[PDB]
Amino acid sequence: PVTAGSSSWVDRTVWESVNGTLQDIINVFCSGDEAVTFVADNQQDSDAAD
């Protein structure tokens, strides 16, 4: 806020950028009905992954 006559307004890149990428991280990881689903290599243990 440099000096009284200077009209020290401030731009908000950083803020309009973060909320940007945050919008997308949430859309990708917290959107689904679920977070994660395990998967097995063999039918031997498929009944545990669930």
Partner: protein, 50 residues
């Protein structure tokens, strides 16, 4: 469900990470696609009597 009733699965009985693939960022609708995969598999398996 087979007998329908909590099986106290000694957790130590479980597999290792070694054997386990994990996935994240599921589509909210994976359900419907899994279902259509199943009904397609179903039409197929019915197609062959063997």
């Amino acid at each position: 469900q087979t007998p329908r009733g909590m099986i106290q699965v000694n957790p130590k009985q479980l597999p290792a990470r070694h054997n386990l693939q994990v996935v994240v960022a599921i589509s909210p609708n994976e359900k419907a696609e899994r279902a259509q995969k199943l009904i397609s598999l179903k039409q197929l398996i019915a197609a062959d009597a063997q």
